[PDB]
A paper describes a structure:
We produced the full-length human [name]/F heterodimer with an APP-tag (EFRHDS) at the N-terminus of the F-chain by co-expression in HEK293 cells, and isolated the heterodimer from the respective homodimers by two successive affinity chromatography steps using anti-tag and anti-[name] antibodies. Tetragonal crystals containing one heterodimer in the asymmetric unit and diffracting to 2.3 Å were obtained at pH 7.0, and the structure was solved by molecular replacement. The two subunits of the [name]/F heterodimer display the expected cystine-knot-like fold made of two β-hairpins connected by intra-chain disulfide linkages. The two polypeptide chains are associated in a head-to-head, parallel fashion, as in the parent homodimeric cytokines. Asn83 of the F-chain carries glycosylation while there is no detectable glycosylation of the A-chain at the predicted site (Asn68). While up to 1/3 of all residues in [name] are disordered, [name]/F shows, like [name], more order, with only 13% of residues lacking electron-density (the first 13 and 15 residues of the F- and A-chain, respectively, and residues 58 to 63 of the flexible coil of the A-chain). In [name]/F, one of the expected two inter-chain disulfides (Cys129A-Cys47F) is well-defined and its assignment agrees with published mass spectrometry data. The dimer interface of [name]/F is very large (total buried surface ≈ 5448 Å2) and engages approximately 55% of all amino-acid residues. In the free [name]/F structure reported here, the flexible coil of the F-subunit is fully ordered and runs across the pocket entrance, hence fully masking Site 2 on this side of the heterodimer. In sharp contrast, the flexible coil of the A chain is partly disordered and runs along the second β-hairpin of the F chain, leaving Site 2 on the other side of the cytokine well accessible to bulk solvent.
Residue numbers in the entry:
A (entry chain A): 39 to 57, 64 to 153
B (entry chain F): 44 to 163
Amino acid sequence: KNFPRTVMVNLNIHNRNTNSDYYNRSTSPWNLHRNEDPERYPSVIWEAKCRHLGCINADGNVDYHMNSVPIQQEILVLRREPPHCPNSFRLEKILVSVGCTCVTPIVHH
Amino acid sequence: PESCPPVPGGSMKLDIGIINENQRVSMSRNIESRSTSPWNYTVTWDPNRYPSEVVQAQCRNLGCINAQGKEDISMNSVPIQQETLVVRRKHQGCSVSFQLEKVLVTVGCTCVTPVIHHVQ
Ligand SMILES: *[C@@H]1O[C@H](CO[C@@H]2O[C@@H](C)[C@@H](O)[C@@H](O)[C@@H]2O)[C@@H](O[C@@H]2O[C@H](CO)[C@@H](O)[C@H](O)[C@H]2NC(C)=O)[C@H](O)[C@H]1NC(C)=O
């Protein structure tokens, strides 16, 4: 019923449902930061960082009565374990900021 | 010259040492409801997948919520996606096999200015 602590997989990574300028067009804009790790698959991960504390209004200015907040997602990555070994990995859980959204400080009634 | 654990031919060894495989920040957070581009979550369970809890987001509206709490459709709510690895468990009979898969998760929505086209 439960997945074992250690599994053997084949060499094929099956792509499912995979394959823009939102970081600038968003009212909660963000910047992307490169995270490279040769011990990791994917080796390069792009991390979002909210550009402002506030959000962009209709005039194109920062309104601090609203907030730019990250949308964070738990993803699984491969880490070569031991680091010098080509075919053994640790399935590693990391929290990634994918982008930012604009929020009211509280849920509005 | 350092030692490596044995790996069968044409395979990859995967250690799954994650505690709380389905733990998600989206459970305690409510940014999906506070957002000007709000979104819904759909939660399914797949016992042959690691992680087994499948969480998808869907934008609630076409436009974005303003100060009054009304939709401004001159702006767009757009979904944002993230790629992740999953482990799929396959059964032929009682025989069990495992495979790595790459999936796309719609994590939430953001509010963007539209792209405008013209006829001529
Ligand atoms: C998004 O979900 C709503 C369901 O309401 C949600 O309920 C809570 C979980 C909370 O998150 C609320 O803020 C949400 O609004 C869908 O609306 C329902 O749709 C059915 C038709 O299928 C209709 O009969 C109900 O009256 C609706 N309920 C409400 C409260 O509006 C809505 O359709 C979903 N949007 C999309 C695009 O999937």
